[PDB]
Ligand binder design. Structure first.
Ligand SMILES: O=c1[nH]c(=O)c2nn[nH]c2[nH]1
Ligand SMILES: O=c1[nH]c(=O)c2nn[nH]c2[nH]1
Ligand SMILES: O=c1[nH]c(=O)c2nn[nH]c2[nH]1
Ligand SMILES: O=c1[nH]c(=O)c2nn[nH]c2[nH]1
Ligand SMILES: [K+]
Ligand SMILES: [K+]
Ligand SMILES: [K+]
Ligand SMILES: [K+]
Ligand SMILES: [K+]
Ligand SMILES: [K+]
Ligand SMILES: [K+]
Ligand SMILES: [K+]
Lengths: 296, 296, 296, 296
């Protein structure tokens, strides 16, 4: 027995930060949940009860608050990079910092057609996330993503031409409902360190916007041949609009809505072109995944 | 031993309905979760294993789909009334139908500044609900509500002047964060039956809008003296804008955001007027309730 | 507009307490989640921004910890009564205290066939709860319950003889699966105050045990004619074994397990007497309720 | 743009299976949730709308039921291997099958001290899982695990000697509460195919038992120097008791229970050796991970 891999830290650290413009009086809020796990020469904490190598997770928690107090918390890619870099620069024996950040939505309220200076609404459970891995001597690897974006289209979704054998019962369809929870991730080119990350700061919010916009427009306008075909179109467009991204990954559940045959009741017609009332299925659900990169 | 009270039925029935305009091609979707519990001369099903008095919950499920297929599913107040009335009119021994409906949000997508004809987004977990109790010989009682409306204001919330004794540690404040999940219910005047409910149909969507609008504006503009004082203002305004409502009830959690003293670290100032980074508290939470009616 | 009803306090207060026997070294842990809402002459806090009538919810939180420190936290019926009584005795303007307690399971671990002195396991999400309403001049009303007790029987459950009409599709069955999450509540005779509650302390744990035992044995041995018939048998037995209880209420979901016809695949037989593989249904679910009292 | 990676299938497929002994009348139930994702020459389904390469996820669902009907569903390692092998043997273009199975607990009820023939109870949310990856030409890789095993010890947990600097506030302790949700995984040596997996069937249940037993005993008896030190002891013991396992991985959250200083209230002593009432913390939580292998 020997330690082959190990990391530890503090998870689920909720953090809120407010910015107050003294000139305009407008306030802006940010809320996130942070997790920081460290790697390094810490094996002895596991094998010899040597806690001298342990930067207490409680201390990691304090550090998250302190860093948020002295640095911008947005874009999350930047905050994560600053936070991760701190650990590998401050502690000689810590060689990797793994920072995950989940950003919660606090959209400014519009009252009587005017943006309110200090009132916000949680419009959607959709999240914007980042996974920032700061590895000593190996720069900063960043994976940005949007998740929990739940959508549905009532038509212009099809699924036919699939393999049919003795295990097949699914009927081909040229008009079905398509609903999913979008989980899209774009992996950035490795960054040499904080300076390079900072040099590209504007691209983070811009690329998130691009990803979300491409996602929504493609979902709404593509007369889908399958979840697979539609998600690929999203990925290729995103790669074409941001050269600093290496790959785009999508994980999409096919949240099924089943037709309900009611012909047994007074010959009521509710299937095919007559389908109006459907039964949303909680489970099971198809799960379609794809990682798209640039061709050589 | 004897049955003092009893009701049974089907809960968590997911229902989706689509409307397709053949003229414009625009489609509109509706999704809800329905629960129908019946009351009546059914005691023998419990005491003598007499299932002859039982309208199978599976049949109640079928009835929900059938009713949704042959009637409008909006406003929910109407659908609930139609569904409830069906049970007490169809079965002589059933004297009460309790219908609960949770409406899920499927907001039409805007693509390139134009509303899309058949694509929707789940913008928020906020729900619009109704509890419709159809009692034979006693009309229809309806309670409408909005829930899961999560908001936050970064200032203009205060709390001072409260009772202070040996159990008190809370410091008075003239500037704090206020965040809550709004659960507001407006109880309608009893309706004599389906005809009367139908005669007031336009008022349901209109009153829901009023309640939501009053909620948001009051929350955003009231320099709150307490959750209690602010919620009362919301209630009185709603009662003043809809004569057919008898009471307005609010249940609001005070989702605390605690200041974080960081002065122990290099004299960092993060409290009082210097407070920027806060610790959102998952629990516990204050819970403030109030039912407001008209004065005599 | 006027306040018709109002209550406020602190919800979701997590509390852990440990007892350490200095003689044996054996430690025993207790964990619960408490909610205390107060009623009284507090209308002005809502109508006039008068916080002088408000016992801060933060103070209510402190009081919960203090009371747990100076009193037994079990049985929950007792702790709830002590806590509720404190508020109506300490504050002249507070006339009702509503205490809800959810008790979490921390069962002592058995290691090598011997009970461990200080290690515990969360065996099941099943909870033991109490709702204690202390009303000045009207004694103490207590509702005890067990919830989250999930069970399943693979046979000896039937359902036939139910009403059949044009809305019915359910096939009669003489052998089906029955699974539910038991929520059982026994309402105690009103107690005049703390002294009377204390005089009956042993009966609380004893009655909870009786309720759980009757529930499990009846569920396992009754060749069920319906959920209704089986739950009634449980209720009548509990009432017969504890004279101080006035009513017993059950709320049981019928968590359906559907047969899967596989005859389309190589004539595979998986229905009726050949049924082996089933599809558990997440939703919808039947919901059966009954409140049983003593006959006159 | 080109597909770099892709897999798809059906997730959250609930499955129940019952075994009925005609001789004794004793019935035994099994319930699980299955996910099967396939890999292979399917890129064209994403890039050219070529569904001919798609084995419908609905068909994958049917296959799960069929396989469960014609094969043992336990141990899960075996069922997963059989199911995964089916896909790569049946479809020439499918080269990998990824099978995840979550086993739910249905423990036989004991009534009056006797095991009941057909009644079960969900004793704990603890799960037994497997991840079976069947790769054509590369055998079968299996990762077995237990998760959701929630435990707590009230003493014999310590944490001192950790790094202390300007970010540290945590006080050293020689007596604290330790609670966690155990997630333990043991990775098996690669198996050449179904025959080899079948040849080791008895070892699966035996090793799961060993892992659970070592986990519970070590947690209860180790006067813990840290979560790190205690989890390592568990891992090394498991590796020493099953030669066919290559690594053991633990992921443990440190679910904090904070002391509550009540000295501000009548000098009440509730800290240090006087600590009785604690505040369980929902978040944040430490997260400690380690993968232990055999030394060379
Ligand atoms: O067991 C522990 N391990 C840790 O790494 C730690 N950090 N703070 N408290 C802790 N406890
Ligand atoms: O036990 C049952 N009670 C019911 O009321 C019912 N309705 N459908 N199936 C049922 N099973
Ligand atoms: O708005 C508030 N109402 C209350 O009753 C209270 N108690 N503590 N803090 C509070 N804030
Ligand atoms: O879009 C889809 N992709 C699939 O792979 C599939 N399988 N069944 N239905 C499906 N729909
Ligand atoms: K370093
Ligand atoms: K699918
Ligand atoms: K009737
Ligand atoms: K409060
Ligand atoms: K009083
Ligand atoms: K039912
Ligand atoms: K193959
Ligand atoms: K920790």
């Amino acid at each position: 027995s020997a330690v082959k891999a190990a990391r530890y830290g503090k998870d689920n650290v909720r953090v809120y930060k407010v910015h107050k413009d003294e000139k305009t009086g407008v306030q802006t809020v940010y809320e996130m949940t942070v997790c920081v796990l460290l790697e390094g020469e810490i094996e002895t904490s596991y094998t010899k009860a040597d806690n001298s190598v342990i930067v207490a997770t409680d201390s990691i928690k304090n550090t998250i608050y302190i860093t948020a107090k002295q640095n911008p918390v947005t874009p999350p890619e930047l905050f994560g990079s600053i936070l991760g870099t701190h650990f590998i620069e401050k502690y000689n024996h810590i060689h990797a910092a793994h920072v995950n950040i989940v950003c919660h939505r606090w959209t400014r309220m519009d009252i009587d057609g005017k943006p309110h200076p200090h009132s916000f609404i949680r419009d959607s459970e959709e999240k914007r996330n980042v996974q920032v891995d700061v590895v000593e001597g190996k720069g900063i690897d960043i994976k940005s993503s949007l998740s929990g974006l739940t959508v549905l289209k009532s038509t212009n979704s099809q699924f036919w031409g699939f393999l049919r054998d003795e295990y097949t019962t699914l009927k081909e369809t040229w008009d079905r409902i398509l609903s999913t929870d979008v989980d899209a991730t774009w992996q950035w080119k490795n960054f040499s360190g904080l300076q390079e990350v900072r040099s590209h700061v504007p691209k983070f919010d811009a690329t998130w916007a691009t990803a979300r916009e491409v996602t929504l427009k493609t979902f709404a306008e593509d007369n889908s041949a399958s979840v697979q075909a539609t998600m690929y179109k999203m990925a290729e467009q995103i790669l074409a609009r941001q050269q600093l991204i290496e790959t785009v990954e999508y994980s999409l559940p096919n949240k099924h809505y089943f037709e309900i045959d009611l012909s047994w009741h007074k010959g009521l017609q509710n299937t095919g072109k007559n389908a109006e009332v459907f039964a949303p299925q909680s489970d099971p659900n198809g799960l379609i995944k794809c990682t798209v990169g640039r061709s050589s």
